[PDB]
């Protein structure tokens, strides 16, 4: 129901773990990892996968880090 209000309205799908799909084609993308409370580099499969997927670090913080507060 609506989204992670509160949290001034964040992509709980950032917070998500890393998802590259079935398709071991790896791209080199990014997500939001919580262990380090940032923007990790992580393979990306294509096909499958998941919300967590960015293709560079300052899209994954514009959208997660959020810098601009809304992105």
Not at 13 to 18: A, D, P, R, T
Not at 27 to 47: D, L, M, S, V
Request: aromatic share 16%; with cysteine.
């Amino acid at each position: 129901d609506y989204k992670d209000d509160d949290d001034k309205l964040k992509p709980d799908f950032c917070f998500l773990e890393e998802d590259p799909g079935i398709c071991r084609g790896y791209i080199t993308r990014y997500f939001y990892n919580n262990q380090t409370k940032q923007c990790e580099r992580f393979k990306y499969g294509g096909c499958l996968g998941n919300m967590n997927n960015f293709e560079t670090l300052e899209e994954c913080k514009n959208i997660c880090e959020d810098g601009p507060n809304g992105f």
